[PDB]
């Protein structure tokens, strides 16, 4: 019912029972307090409208899928699509005050991977990790997502800009199913997913939920439902990954529904002009695969063809590099000229 919260948890790895099991960092603060894990969602009059962008340092996100402070974003991907590396980039290149990571994973390796990453991360002293392996019960796996959320909710009350990561919603929903077997999956899923947001009287929780996909990016009832509740979704396509494009974000099938609210007019114009260029490039790729493209026949197709290298270089991003908003808008400008 209750877990420990506070700045004393910064740098600590917390198990599904609320105790500190490991540390990836030591902090100056020893503040430890207790709040209930089943907190009520914010009332509608207590939430602030999402108007400020949540900068991620990833070019394709910040330019075409701009997140907002208080937004809940879904990340849809199959295995081997760089989901974890995109998570690391969001932690490493964004500018949040505090990062709270909740692993509803399976094997102890996956937990140690993030612990080893955090131990060499620059955001080390601002991160809290909550984990739940496959060895833990279905109740403990569910409580992990709740403990991580309650920890994030305290830092928001203190006024901090918090970024919450739940990996994954799929395994949380599975554990939540077996919970009800003993007695939307109940639904108890929207309760967890409507707790983030920016509060008028405090800070914000910008939440990223991962949803696992099967095969050719197949969205089972799990993925379609979650897609409807959140304020947008980033989708990592398996085919962009095998082509060597990282991050494997298919921007044409991804969206941030608060995009028009968090960027100005000149940004919106550039983003629309670039998305049209992406649509033109995909229309040429299928013409090329059909053997119907020969240079010099269509001046419009030739102009689009010579833009592929410029567009591909903008989309790709080394996971160790982060870009400012101004750099992104400057790069997106040179691409559509």
Swiss-Prot record:
Outcome after substituting residue 81 to V: No change in ATPase activity
Superkingdom field: Bacteria
GO MF assignments: ATP binding; ATP hydrolysis activity; identical protein binding; protein-exporting ATPase activity; proton-transporting ATP synthase activity, rotational mechanism
Amino acids binding ATP: 80-85
Regulation: Oligomerization increases ATPase activity. Monomeric forms exhibit low-level ATPase activity by forming short-lived oligomers with active site contributions from at least two protomers. In contrast, oligomers exhibit enhanced ATP hydrolysis rates that likely result from multiple preformed active sites within the oligomeric complex. Oligomerization is important for both enzyme activation and T3SS function.
Membership in a protein family: Belongs to the ATPase alpha/beta chains family. T3SS ATPase subfamily.
UniProt note: domains: The N-terminal domain is required for oligomerization and ATPase activity. The six N-terminal residues are necessary for proper oligomer formation, though their absence does not entirely preclude oligomerization. The extreme N-terminus is also required for interaction with MxiN/SctL. The N-terminal domain, not ATPase activity, is responsible for localization of Spa47/SctN to the injectisome. The binding of ATP induces a conformational change of a highly conserved luminal loop, facilitating ATP hydrolysis.
Protein's name according to its UniProt entry: Type 3 secretion system ATPase
Upper lineage: Bacteria, Pseudomonadati, Pseudomonadota, Gammaproteobacteria, Enterobacterales
């Amino acid at each position: 019912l209750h877990t420990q919260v506070g700045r004393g948890l910064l740098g600590a790895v917390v198990n599904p029972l609320g105790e500190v099991t490991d540390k990836f960092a030591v902090t100056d603060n020893s503040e430890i307090l207790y709040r209930p894990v089943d907190n009520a969602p914010p009332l509608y009059s207590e939430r602030a409208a999402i108007e400020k962008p949540f900068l991620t340092g990833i070019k394709v996100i910040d330019s075409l899928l701009t997140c907002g402070e208080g937004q809940r974003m879904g990340i849809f991907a199959s295995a081997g699509c760089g989901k974890t590396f995109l998570m690391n980039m969001l932690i490493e290149h964004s500018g949040a005050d505090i990062y709270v990571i909740g692993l509803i994973g399976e094997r102890g390796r996956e937990v140690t991977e993030t612990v080893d990453y955090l131990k060499n991360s620059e955001k080390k002293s601002r991160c809290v990790l909550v984990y739940a392996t496959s060895d833990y019960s279905s109740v403990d796996r569910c409580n992990a997502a709740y403990i991580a959320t309650a920890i994030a909710e305290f830092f928001r009350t203190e006024g901090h800009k918090v970024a919450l990561f739940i990996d994954s919603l799929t395994r949380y929903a599975r554990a939540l199913r077996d919970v009800a077997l003993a007695a939307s999956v109940f639904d108890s899923l929207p309760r967890l997913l409507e707790r983030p947001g920016k509060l008028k009287a405090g800070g914000s929780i910008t939440a990223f939920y991962t949803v696992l996909l099967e095969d050719d990016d197949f969205a089972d009832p799990l993925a379609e439902e979650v897609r409807s509740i959140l304020d947008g979704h980033i989708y990592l396509s398996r085919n962009l990954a095998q082509k060597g494009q990282f991050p494997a974000i298919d921007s044409l099938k991804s969206i941030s529904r608060v995009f028009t609210q968090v960027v100005d007019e000149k940004h919106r114009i550039m983003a629309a002009a670039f998305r049209e260029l992406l649509s033109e490039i995909e229309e040429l790729r299928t013409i090329i695969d059909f053997g119907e493209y020969k240079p010099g026949e269509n001046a419009s197709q030739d102009k689009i063809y010579n833009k592929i290298s410029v567009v591909e270089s903008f989309l790709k991003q080394d996971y160790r590099l982060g870009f400012t908003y101004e750099q992104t808008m400057e790069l997106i400008g040179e691409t559509i000229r």
